[PDB]
């Protein structure tokens, strides 16, 4: 509908796949080469389904900060025959607050879904499903089951992936450029 939705659509059309684990279907953001991200509560194993194709997992790493606190991001390398467009230049370098973000989801349950969530706060610490979690972004939208792994963007930046909510607020794990130096 406007330039925020334009940037979000461009990311969804080229840099997302539908990932299925034993814990459900998730929006999965491809970042570069065969490297993608998913919430850690997806519990990625040795095999994952990518757009309904059985795919070997070459590596999976559940990220933690240097206080050894959960970040809720798992970086997955996929045994896939095709690379993602490299979008690492759209990742923020530092923890920040943002205006006018869009949360975008693409699954069997929620195809081509886009939500203007408005202002995004650097919330920091969250007890997420009983797990102490750092680098959380917060937005005042009543997000629901089915939206985990959803991509949070502003114009020109990919800032986070949706990892939970409390019925009134939604929460995303930060994406930082430093996670994807190779």
Swiss-Prot record:
Provenance organism: Human enterovirus D68
Protein localization: Host cytoplasm
Subunit (UniProt): Interacts with host IFIH1/MDA5; this interaction inhibits host IFIH1.
Domain Peptidase C3: 2-180
Transmembrane spans: none
Protein's name according to its UniProt entry: Protease 3C
Annotated signal sequence range: none
Entire protein: shown range: 1549 to 1729 of 2188
Active-site residues from the entry: 41 (for protease 3c activity), 72 (for protease 3c activity), 148 (for protease 3c activity)
Substrates-to-products reaction catalysed: Selective cleavage of Gln-|-Gly bond in the poliovirus polyprotein. In other picornavirus reactions Glu may be substituted for Gln, and Ser or Thr for Gly
Described function: Major viral protease that mediates proteolytic processing of the polyprotein. Cleaves host EIF5B, contributing to host translation shutoff. Also cleaves host PABPC1, contributing to host translation shutoff. Binds and inhibits host IFIH1/MDA5, thereby inhibiting the type-I IFN production and the establishment of the antiviral state. Cleaves host MAP3K7/TAK1, resulting in inhibition of TRAF6-triggered NF-kappa-B induction. Cleaves host TICAM1; this interaction allows the virus to disrupt host TLR3 signaling. Cleaves host IRF7, resulting in inhibition of type-I IFN production.
Superkingdom of origin organism: Viruses
């Amino acid at each position: 509908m406007g330039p925020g939705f334009d940037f979000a659509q461009a990311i969804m059309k080229k840099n997302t796949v539908i990932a299925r684990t034993e814990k459900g279907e998730f929006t999965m953001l491809g970042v570069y080469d065969r490297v993608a991200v998913i919430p850690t509560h997806a519990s990625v194993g040795e095999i994952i389904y990518i757009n309904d194709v059985e795919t070997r997992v070459l590596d999976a790493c559940a990220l933690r900060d240097l206080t050894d606190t959960n970040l809720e991001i798992t970086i997955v390398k996929l045994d896939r025959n095709q690379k993602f467009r490299d979008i690492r230049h759209f990742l923020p370098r530092c923890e920040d607050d943002y205006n006018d973000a869009v949360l975008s989801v693409h699954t069997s349950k929620f195809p081509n879904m886009y939500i203007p969530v408005g202002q995004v706060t650097n919330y920091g610490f969250l007890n997420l499903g009983g797990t102490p979690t750092h680098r959380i972004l917060m937005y005042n939208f009543p997000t629901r089951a089915g939206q985990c792994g959803g991509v949070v963007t502003t114009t020109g930046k990919v800032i986070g992936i949706h990892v939970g909510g409390n019925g009134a607020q939604g929460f995303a794990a930060m994406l930082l450029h430093s996670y994807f130096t190779d």
